């Protein structure tokens, strides 16, 4: 069906995160330049490229997550450990969560309980927050640096936690004394976790693989190979059928979930640093370590 990625728009330091809002109407970027920039997708695609909002931050940014119910709200995690909820219309920080003691690598707003958000940190803690409360609601003390956290798309009771210990820890937040399951397979730190569906979890790792897992029956499914990822956070994004990730060769890779080697790749000293599908469509946002953003589309 698809053999290539077409470039349909290009906006010319490291972009750590690129994400669409609840309606795939706006998208935001953030990274080491200490600024969250919000763009209008249709304007980017139609025009020959200025953000509609910019919010300056105290610290380098590692991750963004838009709220799934409040259109205008977006969370960020930063290198000081601060997890911030922002309103892109007023530009104000609504909440500043400061309990983490080191860099927070990841933040995720729940889709099904949209006031809930989870973060993970080099301080080896996972923290769950509610936008109506200043103090964390849940704290999980883990043994190693947490690189990524993601809520299950169907229920706010489950999170996947990718750890520097090479494992994915899958928690039921109703009983955090032990994880539901810990998935071993990766040979290096797990840098991203993303769900394709309620029962299908994907991961990326600096062992140069993506992996697919079944979180209903707790099974390994598939390992994906072709890209180069031994060092950096290079991005992972999934939808119902496809996985895309960056590479330290400055190439974006796309896999179909049933096929272990790439369906296609796109050549952008540089590494791809962030990727995001436009929901279940063949359109994708991408960004690299030079700060360039491209809108790509899978095509015949």
């Amino acid at each position: 069906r698809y053999s290539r990625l077409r470039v349909i728009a290009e906006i010319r330091n490291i972009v750590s995160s690129i994400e669409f809002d609840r309606d795939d109407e706006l998208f935001a970027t953030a990274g080491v330049s200490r600024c969250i920039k919000v763009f209008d997708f249709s304007s980017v695609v139609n025009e020959p490229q200025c953000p509609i909002v910019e919010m300056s931050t105290r610290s380098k940014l590692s991750c963004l997550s838009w709220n799934k119910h409040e259109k205008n709200h977006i969370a960020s995690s930063d290198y000081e450990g601060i997890v911030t909820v922002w309103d892109v219309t007023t530009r104000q920080s609504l909440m500043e969560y400061e309990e983490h003691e080191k860099r927070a690598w990841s933040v995720d707003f729940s889709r099904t309980e949209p006031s809930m958000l989870v973060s993970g940190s080099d301080d080896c803690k996972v923290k769950v927050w509610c936008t109506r409360q200043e103090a964390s609601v849940i704290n999980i003390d883990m043994k190693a640096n947490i690189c990524c956290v993601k809520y299950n798309p169907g229920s706010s009771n489950y999170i996947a936690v990718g750890s520097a210990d090479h494992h994915i820890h899958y928690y039921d937040l109703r009983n955090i004394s032990q994880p539901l399951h810990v998935f071993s397979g990766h040979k290096k730190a797990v840098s991203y976790v993303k769900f394709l569906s309620n029962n299908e979890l994907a991961s990326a790792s600096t062992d140069s693989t993506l992996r697919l897992w079944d979180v209903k029956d707790n099974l390994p499914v598939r390992t994906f190979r072709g890209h180069t990822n031994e060092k950096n956070f290079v991005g992972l994004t999934v939808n119902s059928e496809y996985l895309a990730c960056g590479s330290e060769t400055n190439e974006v890779y796309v896999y179909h979930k049933e096929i272990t080697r790439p369906v296609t790749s796109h050549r952008f000293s540089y590494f791809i640093s962030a990727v995001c599908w436009k929901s279940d469509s063949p359109t994708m946002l991408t960004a690299n370590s030079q700060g360039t953003i491209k809108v790509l589309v899978l095509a015949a």
Binding site: N13, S16, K60, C147, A164, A189, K231, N232, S289
Partner: peptide, 7 residues
């Protein structure tokens, strides 16, 4: 160095 996965 930035955006490096902890090891």
């Amino acid at each position: 160095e930035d955006q490096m996965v902890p090891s």
